[PDB]
Design an enzyme around this catalytic site. Structure first.
Site, PDB file in Angstrom:
ATOM      1  CB  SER A  33     -16.318  73.904  -6.697  1.00 44.94           C
ATOM      2  OG  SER A  33     -15.591  73.569  -5.844  1.00 44.94           O
ATOM      3  CE  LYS A  36     -19.343  77.182  -7.869  1.00 42.73           C
ATOM      4  NZ  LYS A  36     -19.136  75.768  -7.246  1.00 42.73           N
ATOM      5  CB  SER A  94     -16.201  78.891  -5.086  1.00 37.83           C
ATOM      6  OG  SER A  94     -16.580  77.575  -6.049  1.00 37.83           O
TER       7      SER A  94
END
EC number: 3.4.16.4
Length: 257
Positions: A33, A36, A94
């Protein structure tokens, strides 16, 4: 030089670019992640950007998180959510549903599938434009998706050049007030930033936690003290508390150097 649990680590003086710490700084690893960060950067770099532009949450975004049991901002399908709120949903909790919405909105194409493929291409282009050679994106959320502590640190530094980006990543809590399918105003449950440094590390200003089955526990961090800003990345640490202590140790070292 501090010892950290992460197998990959890097830190530099954000203002000068001078390296302060390295540990397998150029060894490619899965990013999860932390990807991102690039999603936000690409969005914020769009010529057609409008932070107040509203996006309708599609069932597809919702089904996406469920189909992956992934992290989410709990966006309700039918709601009208601004691009600004989407950036908070992407960066604080997230949210993979938020990332999808952003990729769908800023990718080029006549179908969602086409726009998503286009968005990811935009992510790779942005990397190339930064002169990177060890970074490749295969997704818009981090779910052939690799980078290095150095490359990711540079990406974050570039993103930190945008005031909106800086605002978002240092926000500990954010409550979105969305527009309901029927025109009503909805107060969503508060979004909390997963980056514990914002409250534990004095001077912390960012940037984004990350994790994944292959990426393990990652953290891109940044802090300022005495006009000196240290930015770095820790890749594949062993746990959430370990990733935080790893970052803490590197930052303290970097400030004392």
């Amino acid at each position: 030089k501090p010892t950290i649990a992460a197998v990959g680590g890097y830190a530099m003086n954000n203002g000068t670019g001078t390296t302060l710490y390295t540990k397998a700084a150029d060894t490619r690893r899965s990013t999860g992640s932390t990807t991102k960060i690039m999603t936000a950067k690409v969005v914020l770099a769009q010529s057609n950007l409008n932070l107040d532009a509203k996006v309708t949450i599609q069932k597809a975004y919702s089904d996406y998180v469920v189909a992956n049991n992934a992290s989410q901002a709990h966006l309700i399908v039918g709601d009208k959510v601004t691009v600004r709120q989407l950036l908070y949903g992407l960066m604080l909790p997230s949210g993979n549903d938020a990332a999808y919405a952003l990729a769908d909105k800023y990718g080029s194409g006549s179908t969602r599938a086409a726009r998503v493929k286009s968005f990811i291409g935009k992510m790779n282009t942005a990397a190339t434009n930064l002169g990177l050679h060890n970074t490749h994106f295969d997704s818009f959320d981090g779910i052939a998706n690799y980078s290095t502590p150095r490359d990711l640190t540079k990406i974050a530094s570039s993103a930190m050049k945008n005031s909106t980006f800086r605002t978002v990543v240092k926000t500990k809590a954010y409550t979105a007030k969305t527009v309901t399918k029927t025109g009503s105003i909805r107060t969503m449950d508060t979004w909390k930033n997963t980056n514990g440094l914002l409250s534990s590390y004095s001077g912390a200003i960012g940037v984004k936690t990350g994790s994944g089955p292959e990426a393990k526990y990652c953290l891109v961090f940044a802090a300022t003290r005495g006009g000196k800003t240290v930015i770095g990345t820790v890749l594949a640490s062993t746990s959430i508390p370990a990733r935080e202590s790893d970052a803490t140790k590197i930052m303290n070292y970097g400030f004392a150097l």
